[PDB]
C-alpha cells in the first residue's frame, strides 16, 4: 500500500528504503496508466528527491530517478510537482555520477522536465544542463543512451514562446552537425527534428543553421530510405525556404529540387501536400528560383496534383501556381499556360475555402496583367473552361476582397 511504501522509503535502513522505492517504481512503470496523483498526494516526492542524494547507494539513486522520470512523464501539473520538489539540481548532479545507469536515468528525467515547456526548459538551461548533456556524445556512448541524449536535444530546441537562448543554440548546433552523419534511424530522425525546430524559430535562427554548414548534409536526407527521415528533412528545409531569397538559394544550391519527383508521386497524400508547400515557397522567389522549379521538370506534376490531388494538396498547388506569378516572367507564365494550368486553376474557384478562392483570383489577375498581347488569348482560355462564369458568380461573394477582385478582373479584361 502507498502508506507503507512511503513509510518504508523514509527509513534509515537503506535496504528497506531500496525495497520501498522499487515498489513505488513498479507501481509507476507497470502499465501506461500509472497512479501518479496517488503517489504524489501520499508525499513520496521529497523522499525520492532525498534518495537522489545517496551517492553511497547508486541503486537507490537509479530507482528514485526512474520513479521520478515516470512521474514527470505525466501532465504538466505532475512534472511541475517534480520540479517544485527541487529535483532538477540533483538530476544535474547525477549527470556526473560514475555509474552509467544513474547518468542515463537522470538524462531521461531531465528530458521529460525540459519537454514540459519553455519556462521549465529555460530553468534547466540556466542551471547548465547543455554542456554536460553534450559531453556524453563520444565514440563509446551506448546507442540507447545516445538516442535519449538526442531526444533531450530535440526537447531543448522545440518550444517557441520564447525560443531557446542563442547561447544554447550555439552550443547545440555543432553537436547536431556531428550527429547528422549517424546512420541510426532514431538518432537521425531526432537530429533532423531538432534542426527543423531551430529553422522554424525565425530568420536569425535560420541563418545560424545555414552558417553552421549543415544544410548540404540535411538536403540529401530528402531521399533517405526511411520515410520518417524524409519527412523530418522536408520540414527542416521547408522552414529554411520560408526565409529570404538568399537562404532559399542556399537550399537550392544543394540540389534540393532533384529530390522532389519521388515526393510528388509518393503514395502518401500528406507527403504530396508537404512537398507542394515547399515548392510553393520556392515559386514565391525571384525569377531564377521559379526557373529552377521549371528546369527541374516539376511543373507538370504540380499541375496534375492541382487537377486530381486531394483537396489539401490542391490548395498547396494553387498557392504554388499563384506565388509563381509574384516575380515570374511572362515567358514562365506562358510555360504554365502551355502546360494546361487554366482549367484546373479555375476549377478550384468553387470550393468552400475562401482563401483558396482569393489565391486563385490573385494568380489569374497577375497572369492577365502580366500579359499585354496574350491577354485576349488568356481571357478566351479562361472563358472556354468555364472560369469566367465562376468569376462572374464570385462577383456576388460575401468576402469583400474576393468580390472586389472579381469586379476588377471582369472590368479590366472581360468587359470591352
Amino acid at each position: 500500500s502507498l502508506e507503507a511504501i512511503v513509510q518504508n522509503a523514509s527509513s534509515d535502513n537503506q535496504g528497506i528504503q531500496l525495497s520501498a522505492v522499487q515498489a513505488a517504481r513498479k507501481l509507476l512503470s507497470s502499465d501506461r496508466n500509472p497512479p501518479i496523483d496517488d503517489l504524489i498526494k501520499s508525499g513520496i516526492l521529497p523522499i525520492l528527491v532525498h534518495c537522489l542524494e545517496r551517492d553511497d547507494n547508486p541503486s537507490l539513486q537509479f530507482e528514485a530517478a526512474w520513479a521520478l522520470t515516470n512521474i514527470a512523464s505525466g501532465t504538466s501539473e505532475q512534472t511541475q510537482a517534480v520540479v517544485q520538489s527541487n529535483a532538477v539540481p540533483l538530476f544535474l548532479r547525477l549527470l556526473h555520477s560514475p555509474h552509467q545507469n544513474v547518468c542515463e536515468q537522470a538524462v531521461w528525467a531531465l528530458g521529460n522536465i525540459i519537454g514540459d515547456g519553455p519556462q521549465c526548459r529555460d530553468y534547466v538551461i540556466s542551471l547548465g544542463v547543455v554542456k554536460p548533456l553534450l559531453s556524453f556524445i563520444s565514440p563509446s556512448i551506448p546507442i540507447t543512451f545516445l538516442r535519449n541524449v538526442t531526444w533531450v536535444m530535440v526537447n531543448l530546441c522545440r518550444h517557441k514562446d520564447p525560443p531557446p537562448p542563442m547561447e544554447t543554440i550555439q552550443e547545440i548546433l555543432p553537436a547536431l552537425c556531428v550527429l547528422i552523419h549517424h546512420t541510426d534511424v532514431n538518432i537521425l530522425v531526432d537530429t533532423v527534428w531538432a534542426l527543423s525546430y531551430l529553422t522554424d524559430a525565425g530568420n536569425e535562427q535560420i541563418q545560424m543553421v545555414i552558417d553552421s554548414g549543415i544544410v548540404p548534409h540535411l538536403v540529401p536526407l530528402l531521399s533517405h530510405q526511411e520515410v520518417k527521415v524524409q519527412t523530418a528533412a522536408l520540414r527542416a528545409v521547408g522552414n529554411i525556404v520560408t526565409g529570404t531569397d538568399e537562404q532559399t538559394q542556399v537550399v537550392l544550391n544543394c540540389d534540393a529540387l532533384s529530390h522532389f519527383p519521388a515526393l510528388l508521386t509518393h503514395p502518401k497524400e500528406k507527403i504530396n501536400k508537404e512537398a507542394v508547400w515547399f515548392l510553393s515557397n520556392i515559386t514565391a522567389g525571384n525569377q531564377q528560383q521559379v526557373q529552377a522549379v521549371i528546369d527541374a521538370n516539376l511543373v507538370p506534376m504540380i499541375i496534375h496534383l492541382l487537377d486530381k490531388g486531394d483537396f489539401g494538396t490542391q490548395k498547396e498547388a494553387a498557392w504554388a501556381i499563384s506565388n509563381l506569378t509574384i516575380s515570374g516572367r511572362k515567358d514562365q507564365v506562358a510555360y504554365l499556360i502551355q502546360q494546361n494550368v487554366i482549367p484546373p486553376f479555375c476549377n478550384l474557384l468553387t470550393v468552400k475555402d475562401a482563401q483558396v478562392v482569393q489565391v486563385v483570383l490573385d494568380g489569374l489577375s497577375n497572369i492577365l496583367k502580366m500579359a499585354e498581347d496574350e491577354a485576349e488569348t488568356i481571357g478566351n482560355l479562361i472563358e472556354e473552361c468555364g472560369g469566367l462564369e465562376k468569376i462572374e458568380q464570385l462577383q456576388n461573394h460575401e468576402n469583400e476582397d474576393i468580390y472586389k477582385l472579381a469586379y476588377e478582373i471582369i472590368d479590366q479584361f472581360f468587359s470591352s
Binding site: R32, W66, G115, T231, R235, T242, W277, G312, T325, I326
Partner: peptide, 26 residues
C-alpha cells in the same frame, strides 16, 4: 495575399514525443 508561408496546421504530425515513461518490459 501571395508570398511565402510557414508550416501549415496538420503537416508533419509524427513529431517526437515531449515526454517518455520508462516501462518495465518494453
Amino acid at each position: 495575399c501571395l508570398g511565402r508561408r510557414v508550416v501549415q496546421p496538420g503537416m508533419f504530425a509524427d513529431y517526437p514525443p515531449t515526454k517518455k515513461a520508462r516501462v518495465l518490459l518494453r
